[PDB]
Symmetry: C3
Amino acid sequence: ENGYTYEDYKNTAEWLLSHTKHRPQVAIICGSGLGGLTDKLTQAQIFDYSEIPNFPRSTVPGHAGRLVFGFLNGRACVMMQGRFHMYEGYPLWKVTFPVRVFHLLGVDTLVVTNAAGGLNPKFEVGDIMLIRDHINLPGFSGQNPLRGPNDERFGDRFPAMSDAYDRTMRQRALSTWKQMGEQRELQEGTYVMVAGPSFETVAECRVLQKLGADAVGMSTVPEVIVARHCGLRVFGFSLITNKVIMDYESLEKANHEEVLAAGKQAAQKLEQFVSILMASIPLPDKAS
Amino acid sequence: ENGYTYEDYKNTAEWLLSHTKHRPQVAIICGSGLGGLTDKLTQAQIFDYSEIPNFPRSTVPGHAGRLVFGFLNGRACVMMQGRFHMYEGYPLWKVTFPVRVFHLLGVDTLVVTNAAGGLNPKFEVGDIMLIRDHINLPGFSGQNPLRGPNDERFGDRFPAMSDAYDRTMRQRALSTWKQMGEQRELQEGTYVMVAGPSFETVAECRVLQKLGADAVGMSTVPEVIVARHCGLRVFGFSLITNKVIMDYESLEKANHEEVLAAGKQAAQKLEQFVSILMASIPLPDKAS
Amino acid sequence: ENGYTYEDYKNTAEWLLSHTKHRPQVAIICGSGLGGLTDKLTQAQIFDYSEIPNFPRSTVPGHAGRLVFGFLNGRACVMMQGRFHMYEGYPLWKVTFPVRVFHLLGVDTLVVTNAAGGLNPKFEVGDIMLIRDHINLPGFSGQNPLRGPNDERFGDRFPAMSDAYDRTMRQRALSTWKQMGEQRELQEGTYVMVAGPSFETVAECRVLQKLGADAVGMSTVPEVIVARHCGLRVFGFSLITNKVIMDYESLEKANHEEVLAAGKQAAQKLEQFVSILMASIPLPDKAS
Ligand SMILES: O=c1[nH]cnc2c([C@@H]3N[C@H](CO)[C@@H](O)[C@H]3O)c[nH]c12
Ligand SMILES: O=c1[nH]cnc2c([C@@H]3N[C@H](CO)[C@@H](O)[C@H]3O)c[nH]c12
Ligand SMILES: O=c1[nH]cnc2c([C@@H]3N[C@H](CO)[C@@H](O)[C@H]3O)c[nH]c12
């Protein structure tokens, strides 16, 4: 939590607000290859992290990392193209800083997307997995973005996470997928967050799946945790980029280079699905 | 380990000693809702962390956190009302600082108490679980209070922990419980330490139980580790405050608010049990 | 990764090179009790960490920790007698610093040796386990030596580790062992890295084996990770020093003191095996 003071977040939200006529309701954190979602915004207004007052800049990828305000399928959004990861060096209170400010911007929902490895055998690369749960490996050890002294202005000391991924939004999504006439089913599973940048060995791959994880990635979990601490409605997707877990013959490993496809149709389909799902995010106007 | 120098601990123990006529033999670290145990001390002398020379102050809860010297059922004690946790921001060498000083005070036994979630289905909220073992999740990753350069004046480089929770004291306790005429049995199990302040998701809850943990909490393990490194006799209890692990329907989750009961009878019963157990802690006077 | 700049490593390799006529091809990191391997070098040239420009000094054991250049069974080597461990306080980018410099020295292979606990029941103390895989517990949580901003000059952002331990070198080794006429077989397994200096409890011992680890230690994994990031050929051995995992009666625990044997025949045999294996490390001269 530390590093930043409540006023820090307030000065950043206040600056954004005074700089964009936009008042975001939905915050979207695009995983790798999912940045083109920003292409769908109307009335887009871009802010390079760089420009925003206390916003962590990108460790190299700034030339990808930006904040885009606009409208997506009826919702006022703010998208984070190029999220921060623990592995780049950002302590978790920098990684999740955007979230805390989105909260002060007025954002009430956060849709997190990521590129993950398929641990569930059922999964196929290209698959989209609705996140129904997560295992926060960094959090178990101390790397919980909430670590440090708690600010009741954002939330409780011990926020529950057993209900992090909105059930309703997960039902809607599933329904949206069905009604889309999408044949291949919307997969659902537990995302296990792993830190380090290096990729998993077959042995680690096996602990991850025996732990009950369906997809492994290096992000999402921190942002979710602080979003939920904030009280935001959270739900997200995982784009399965590679498959993992076998030393029967572990030579080629379909290594994430499938990021070429992240600049392809699967990514595109997730972006579309996410865009259609805006219609399922309750308007703050009671929309009932 | 670092942050503090051996002389730091010595200056703190020396100050306490020169400030209390008391010479503690037993150190008791009260978990949440177990602070009323201090109410049982005779000849109580209170020290707010604040007042003690190198003692970490509380991140907000100072208004709960204090050190009380006194006598409990025949033993000269020093109780820590309101222990420190990793999640509040304290590096582990601050969390476990008290222990190192209790050691220099002359303390030879440490009874650790905590409020934990029931992972073992057998457990019921209100249950008291004698800690027979622990899984130090933060320790596996690097968060071991002993990390840093070792002081042979406190202990070895590689202290064993396979025998952390005194078997004798665990037998006595079990016997004390039986002889107390207590019907509901004294549960015994492995306490899994988890760091982060946010609560466990059903998926994490499942890794914890498949890992063989019976109770999950966010403390105890560090203090135990350094107590044992010090050579102190350690044994402890876990007050089961909530139950955990099911998404069959994971809406209400009996969230720790059962801390109301921590200001209730279950807490009270653990406090009493702990007090009766003083009679089972060998006097340094050879007491044979 | 941070703490050091690319130029740091370059200034250290450059200094070593300008200080030793030696041009190492093989780097050997000796685990505990395996330092006598340095006794096998011809044309040995010793450098105390202390003397090398940006080289982390030892937290106490400097009086053991040194870098020895020489020739071992046909290969130009550089040995690290007394490696660094997370538990001594070294952040992982100090622990693995040697590796990055060995790389700039021209080293293309790294043989890592360690002393580990036997989790696989098949193992017997004294046994040598060829590392076929690893589970990086510290890495899952954030302690990955690669954490921080990536230097493409050393390697990729997301290096794969599924193929860390050279299969060929693991075949050769196995063959070398067979041809040595060694009766007791060369064990092979997954090494699980655990951080903290304190030893495992029976409960932790059980999570480690249910996780599929065969041997537990507190090193190797970081060095391997950065070696592989560097592109070096990595393979290694684990000398089983103690056995672990049972509370049926967990009193004496064959605690690592078997390090007496680390100054004995088992250690000696690993040192010999490692020395014979030099003949199996491809010469850079295309050696075909
Ligand atoms: O197999 C995998 N393990 C861990 N992370 C990833 C990813 C995620 N996608 C991004 C590109 O690989 C990267 O930031 C990482 O978090 C794809 N496949 C895997
Ligand atoms: O389900 C649980 N998971 C992790 N910790 C706790 C606790 C412990 N009790 C205190 C109040 O919930 C808090 O400091 C935490 O360490 C009670 N229930 C749980
Ligand atoms: O049972 C064990 N658990 C963890 N490490 C070790 C070791 C390793 N050997 C060294 C001496 O015990 C020490 O640095 C540690 O990493 C031997 N046995 C065990």
